[PDB]
Tab-separated table of C-alpha atoms and ligand atoms in Angstrom:
chain	number	residue	atom	x	y	z
A	1	UNK	CA	-8.336	-11.508	-3.681
A	2	UNK	CA	-6.015	-10.883	-6.626
A	3	UNK	CA	-7.073	-7.664	-8.334
A	4	UNK	CA	-6.883	-6.761	-11.946
A	5	UNK	CA	-4.935	-3.624	-12.786
A	6	UNK	CA	-7.931	-1.497	-13.791
A	7	UNK	CA	-10.170	-3.000	-11.100
A	8	UNK	CA	-7.711	-1.864	-8.428
A	9	UNK	CA	-7.267	1.558	-10.007
A	10	UNK	CA	-11.038	2.066	-9.837
A	11	UNK	CA	-11.229	0.885	-6.229
A	12	UNK	CA	-8.372	3.157	-5.175
A	13	UNK	CA	-9.989	6.116	-6.967
A	14	UNK	CA	-13.304	5.577	-5.196
A	15	UNK	CA	-11.423	5.509	-1.869
A	16	UNK	CA	-9.807	8.944	-2.467
A	17	UNK	CA	-6.231	8.016	-3.395
A	18	UNK	CA	-6.032	9.781	-6.782
A	19	UNK	CA	-3.719	12.760	-6.184
A	20	UNK	CA	-3.772	12.150	-2.395
A	21	UNK	CA	-0.932	14.308	-1.035
A	22	UNK	CA	-0.071	14.950	-4.685
A	23	UNK	CA	0.515	11.318	-5.762
A	24	UNK	CA	-1.392	10.464	-8.936
A	25	UNK	CA	-3.292	7.189	-9.188
A	26	UNK	CA	-0.612	5.459	-11.273
A	27	UNK	CA	1.856	5.768	-8.391
A	28	UNK	CA	-0.433	3.803	-6.051
A	29	UNK	CA	-1.132	1.100	-8.676
A	30	UNK	CA	2.588	0.751	-9.462
A	31	UNK	CA	3.400	0.429	-5.752
A	32	UNK	CA	0.741	-2.245	-5.270
A	33	UNK	CA	2.030	-4.233	-8.266
A	34	UNK	CA	5.553	-4.495	-6.962
A	35	UNK	CA	4.724	-4.775	-3.271
A	36	UNK	CA	2.100	-7.546	-3.523
A	37	UNK	CA	1.440	-8.427	-7.190
A	38	UNK	CA	-2.097	-7.067	-6.496
A	39	UNK	CA	-2.782	-9.857	-3.917
A	40	UNK	CA	-4.561	-8.712	-0.761
A	41	UNK	CA	-3.366	-11.826	1.086
A	42	UNK	CA	0.395	-11.193	0.642
A	43	UNK	CA	2.596	-11.411	3.769
A	44	UNK	CA	6.361	-11.208	4.096
A	45	UNK	CA	8.577	-11.440	7.189
A	46	UNK	CA	11.385	-8.952	7.806
A	47	UNK	CA	14.812	-9.536	9.356
A	48	UNK	CA	13.909	-7.526	12.464
A	49	UNK	CA	10.974	-9.848	13.195
A	50	UNK	CA	8.239	-7.547	11.924
A	51	UNK	CA	5.925	-8.593	9.093
A	52	UNK	CA	4.447	-6.737	6.088
A	53	UNK	CA	0.728	-7.219	5.290
A	54	UNK	CA	-1.600	-6.815	2.343
A	55	UNK	CA	-1.737	-5.119	-1.002
A	56	UNK	CA	0.547	-2.285	0.180
A	57	UNK	CA	2.767	-4.379	2.514
A	58	UNK	CA	2.153	-2.324	5.654
A	59	UNK	CA	4.629	-3.159	8.456
A	60	UNK	CA	3.802	-4.380	11.976
A	61	UNK	CA	6.646	-2.522	13.674
A	62	UNK	CA	4.843	0.820	13.262
A	63	UNK	CA	1.363	0.573	11.783
A	64	UNK	CA	-0.664	-2.461	12.912
A	65	UNK	CA	-0.756	-5.073	15.682
A	66	UNK	CA	-0.038	-8.743	14.909
A	67	UNK	CA	0.586	-9.918	18.467
A	68	UNK	CA	4.158	-10.995	17.729
A	69	UNK	CA	6.240	-7.816	17.103
A	70	UNK	CA	7.544	-6.723	20.519
A	71	UNK	CA	7.809	-2.998	21.109
A	72	UNK	CA	5.633	-2.179	18.097
A	73	UNK	CA	3.303	0.730	17.717
A	74	UNK	CA	-0.143	0.271	16.216
A	75	UNK	CA	-0.352	3.723	14.661
A	76	UNK	CA	-3.301	2.771	12.391
A	77	UNK	CA	-5.070	1.168	15.394
A	78	UNK	CA	-5.937	-2.026	13.522
A	79	UNK	CA	-5.062	-5.734	13.693
A	80	UNK	CA	-2.731	-6.540	10.815
A	81	UNK	CA	-5.137	-9.261	9.626
A	82	UNK	CA	-7.646	-6.553	8.671
A	83	UNK	CA	-5.148	-5.516	5.976
A	84	UNK	CA	-5.574	-8.851	4.149
A	85	UNK	CA	-9.283	-8.409	3.380
A	86	UNK	CA	-10.738	-8.409	-0.134
A	87	UNK	CA	-12.103	-4.989	0.924
A	88	UNK	CA	-9.175	-2.546	0.641
A	89	UNK	CA	-10.687	0.137	2.882
A	90	UNK	CA	-8.472	-0.551	5.896
A	91	UNK	CA	-5.309	-0.691	3.780
A	92	UNK	CA	-6.174	2.571	2.037
A	93	UNK	CA	-7.027	4.426	5.248
A	94	UNK	CA	-3.746	3.325	6.847
A	95	UNK	CA	-1.724	4.194	3.713
A	96	UNK	CA	-3.109	7.738	3.895
A	97	UNK	CA	-1.616	8.041	7.395
A	98	UNK	CA	1.735	6.642	6.243
A	99	UNK	CA	2.077	8.909	3.188
A	100	UNK	CA	1.306	11.947	5.367
A	101	UNK	CA	4.057	11.273	7.950
A	102	UNK	CA	6.793	13.307	6.233
A	103	UNK	CA	8.513	11.012	3.697
A	104	UNK	CA	5.716	10.702	1.158
A	105	UNK	CA	5.718	7.493	-0.835
A	106	UNK	CA	9.417	6.887	-0.141
A	107	UNK	CA	8.118	4.851	2.821
A	108	UNK	CA	7.486	2.052	0.249
A	109	UNK	CA	10.873	0.722	-0.838
A	110	UNK	CA	9.504	-0.827	-4.029
A	111	UNK	CA	7.924	2.483	-5.032
A	112	UNK	CA	11.256	4.280	-4.610
A	113	UNK	CA	13.171	1.646	-6.519
A	114	UNK	CA	10.744	0.644	-9.289
A	115	UNK	CA	8.137	3.401	-9.725
A	116	UNK	CA	9.644	6.768	-8.766
A	117	UNK	CA	10.848	8.630	-11.831
A	118	UNK	CA	9.122	6.296	-14.324
A	119	UNK	CA	6.054	6.773	-16.516
A	120	UNK	CA	3.555	5.724	-13.845
A	121	UNK	CA	0.575	6.878	-15.911
A	122	UNK	CA	1.070	3.699	-17.941
A	123	UNK	CA	-0.345	1.723	-15.011
A	124	UNK	CA	-3.806	3.226	-15.568
A	125	UNK	CA	-3.698	3.516	-19.369
A	126	UNK	CA	-6.766	1.971	-20.987
A	127	UNK	CA	-8.843	1.797	-17.792
A	128	UNK	CA	-12.367	3.185	-17.644
A	129	UNK	CA	-12.091	5.676	-14.780
B	201	LIG	CL1	-1.073	8.524	-12.965
B	202	LIG	CL1	12.997	-2.790	-4.364
B	203	LIG	NA1	-9.123	-5.155	-14.382
B	204	LIG	NA1	2.707	-3.366	15.930
């Protein structure tokens, strides 16, 4: 599923991400835009052989099991394919674990490079929330 901007904002709000660990909703929407272009089916392979999955591009070296990343942890205890669903619940629940691990949203390279320090409230402007 490819989400609309306000549709995703509403879904993330219902799943408890607004101000989760102090990150306002616009941060999560901005990160999803530049990680996946709001496409739940996005996958990208990394140089080390791991792969990133879903709307928030969660990596198989640490967070999910894809059966082909040797020596990986499955810290979210989920198959990586569950992260590609039109239902974002599994991606959101895993992202909450990631953002709590010490480095905040700096775990998402595109957030650090394209969202951090910008007017992220613009990503939810105009949405009925
Ligand atoms: Cl915001
Ligand atoms: Cl980047
Ligand atoms: Na929308
Ligand atoms: Na893994």
